[PDB]
Design a protein around this ligand. Structure first.
Ligand SMILES: [Cl-]
Ligand SMILES: [Cl-]
Ligand SMILES: [K+]
Ligand SMILES: [K+]
Ligand code: NA
Ligand code: NA
Lengths: 327, 327
């Protein structure tokens, strides 16, 4: 699975999904250009939230036509029709009609209510907003998937001939043992859904009992808890990074391990570890990453980097559509 | 500073130091062969602790002569002469003459007492023993250097044209803010002593205020505390790894930073982060590392990997001799 091969696999899987993805940042130039690519290539039907005139002016300003597969929704027209639904959804938290109308001025809230009404299949935003702005309404309204008590994330690491899965390198600062086992299971399910055989390495500064301490025991607990809920999955830990990827190190420090030496899914003990290793490997191996992709949400939601490129948005919409077919 | 250039710089600095390094594993084949190289190249005078006949048989078994610069000490001859000193050193902890004699059967204890008696300048062991076996007697008897409340460690990361310093990637599992500031200062002093201009990046999953949480505040506290004790040092944090090494990321996320974009010393928030990133970078960039090197000890002590090679031992003796001239 080379980087071009994996990127095409995302295109193939998204086409077979045949999903509708709402884009709250409907008039954003990068998002308009990416939506037209997804429609022309069959990656997804893109629902743009914004003024039809402005979106078409932005589309014309970038040499892009919005034909089939592009559906523009004017928030001013449809906003009031979702007020009653939002009041009903948050009535026990003190939602009023006036407050609900105030919240619906944000296109992410509007797209989330469209997502909750099963009018679209997924939501992508964040090119010109914060991560919290993208995920807070879905967290409040869509909630977590059954069997998940939290949302985590993964990065797809595109090596020259294979794809690794890293997580959680963006969201959860300090997972407990129970949460870490949940992150490992979510990440392995994500890997399998995107064509990656999950061999899950629970990372630590200790390989087995080479090191001791509360930090090592948390990874050991999470390993056992994850194996309890999913006896079918190949999980092992604790493992240092070299033991997870090198067969020679595996044969010397963890020879009875079904994961060591050939791990494909790498679960980091905390965000310090995950984000630092993710950033360092991106520079040192000079490889390519796709993500981060959220996991554990009841319906797919994903947040873009504020400096994302058009192609970054294109494949993020693909991931979101593929996640919709997974559920 | 290419890897060959840096390795020669260690040779030059060790020669100028002109130190004596005691080797408790005196009859170990790899250690005997490395000691003769250090003596012939002028890296250090090596004091081998073992049976003179056995050491010479091991030396002859590897095509190696032990001439000038090699001094063999028979533990059976000199052990009793250090019993009274050990009793005096640990009298308040319940040391007796019989217990002291029992402890002196371990050559590391004997070499540590030689180190404490200023008969040698540094100690290297661990090729056939655990790390705890190497460092416990010095920790009990030599103690920490003035201004240091703990011992930490660094790895020298030999990039194609420069050398980075990583720490602490081996010893301290979860440093407090005060300890982390101490690790940063020790690591910068180590870097400068080995010909590396210290620009210290205090690593985190947050660049500045990009992320919040107790983990980020610890790095922020350690950054300020380290700057308080050493106003002359270039320290900054918190910084993600990409902000520390990439000028473009630095100009966008930390433009007022005197370290971001050109860091040479990388201080990891905990052992999970340090060891995982160290192991991952070694595989991803396929670079070369030297270490780990202890720091903060009153007199230099260093521990070998049990799978170390002869050349690994050679340059570890060099590091230890260089550390002796630093103090
Ligand atoms: Cl274990
Ligand atoms: Cl800050
Ligand atoms: K964002
Ligand atoms: K050792
Ligand atoms: Na690898
Ligand atoms: Na670099």
């Amino acid at each position: 699975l080379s980087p071009p091969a994996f990127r095409y696999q995302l295109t193939e899987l998204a086409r077979k999904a045949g999903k509708r993805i709402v884009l709250p940042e409907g008039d954003e130039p990068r998002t308009v250009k990416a939506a037209a690519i997804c429609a022309e290539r069959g990656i997804a039907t893109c629902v743009l939230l914004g003024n039809p005139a402005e979106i078409n002016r932005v589309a014309a300003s970038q040499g892009v036509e919005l034909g089939a597969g592009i559906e523009i929704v004017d928030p001013e027209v449809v906003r009031e029709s979702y007020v009653g639904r939002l009041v009903e959804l948050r009535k026990n938290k003190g939602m009023t009609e006036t407050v609900a109308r105030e919240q619906l001025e944000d296109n992410v809230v509007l797209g989330t209510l469209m997502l909750e009404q099963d009018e679209v299949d997924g939501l992508v935003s964040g090119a010109v907003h914060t991560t919290a702005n993208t995920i807070r309404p879905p967290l409040q309204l869509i909630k977590t998937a059954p069997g998940s008590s939290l949302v985590s994330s993964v990065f797809f690491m595109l090596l020259p001939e294979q794809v690794y899965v890293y997580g959680d390198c963006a969201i959860n600062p300090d997972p407990t043992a129970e949460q870490l086992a949940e992150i490992a299971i979510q990440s392995a399910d994500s890997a399998a859904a995107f064509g990656i055989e999950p061999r899950v390495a629970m990372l630590s500064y200790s390989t087995g009992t080479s090191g001791a301490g509360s930090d090592v025991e948390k990874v050991r607990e999470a390993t056992r808890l994850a194996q309890e809920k999913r006896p079918d999955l190949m999980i092992d830990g604790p493992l240092q990074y070299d033991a997870a990827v090198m067969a020679d190190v595996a044969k010397s420090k963890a020879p009875n391990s079904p994961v060591a030496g050939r791990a494909t899914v790498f679960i980091f003990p905390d965000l310090n570890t995950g984000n630092t290793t993710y950033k360092a490997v991106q520079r040192s191996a000079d490889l390519i990453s796709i993500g981060p992709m959220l996991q554990g949400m009841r319906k797919p939601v994903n947040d873009l980097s504020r400096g994302a490129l058009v192609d970054d948005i294109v494949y993020t919409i693909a991931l979101t559509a593929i996640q919709s077919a997974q559920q």
